[PDB]
Ligand binder design. Structure first.
Ligand code: HEM
Length: 137
């Protein structure tokens, strides 16, 4: 289930983080605007850069922490507060996060692994809920 999916993702964090990030950017190329150092590069070019892996790994690790602390796929308000206060997400609306988890679920379902895609859907929705309640437009 959801908790084993955290263990599975964390088992190959750097790998999963990139392939999911790429799935997200390729599904929503309009989101790539937010990542100006990644514009104009293919999936392989990005993977070959050390900063791409470094950054995705950092993000995805925090995403797993938030998931691991979530109750029944409901993230802590104080974990949602952090993501809203982040000086990097300054812009960004709950739309962006919503889009992400669509790509995340779609990835898991296409993966072939026994991900509990439903729980990650439910987690993405409950986070998008917590983000607004934490002051995200
Ligand atoms: C759980 C979901 C998310 C987590 C945990 C998360 C986490 C983080 C973290 C930790 C950073 C800091 C990067 C660094 O210092 O290297 C960051 C930066 C950033 N995040 Fe997120 N993020 C999430 C969702 C999103 C979404 C949906 C977007 C929008 C598409 C986004 C866009 C960014 C951007 C633009 C930065 C700036 C990083 C940079 O330019 O170096 N994030 N994120």
């Amino acid at each position: 289930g959801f908790k084993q999916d955290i263990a599975t993702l964390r088992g190959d964090l750097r790998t999963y983080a990139q392939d999911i990030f790429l799935a997200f950017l390729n599904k929503y190329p309009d989101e790539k605007r937010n990542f100006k150092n990644y514009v104009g590069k293919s999936d392989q070019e990005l993977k070959s850069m050390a900063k791409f892996g470094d950054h995705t790994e950092k993000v995805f690790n925090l995403m797993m922490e938030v998931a691991d602390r979530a109750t029944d796929c409901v993230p802590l308000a104080s974990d949602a507060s952090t993501l809203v206060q982040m000086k990097q997400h300054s812009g960004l609306t709950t739309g962006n996060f919503e889009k992400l988890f669509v790509a995340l679920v779609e990835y898991m379902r296409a993966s072939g692994q026994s991900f509990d895609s439903q729980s990650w859907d439910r987690f993405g929705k409950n986070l998008v809920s917590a983000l607004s309640s934490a002051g995200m437009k």
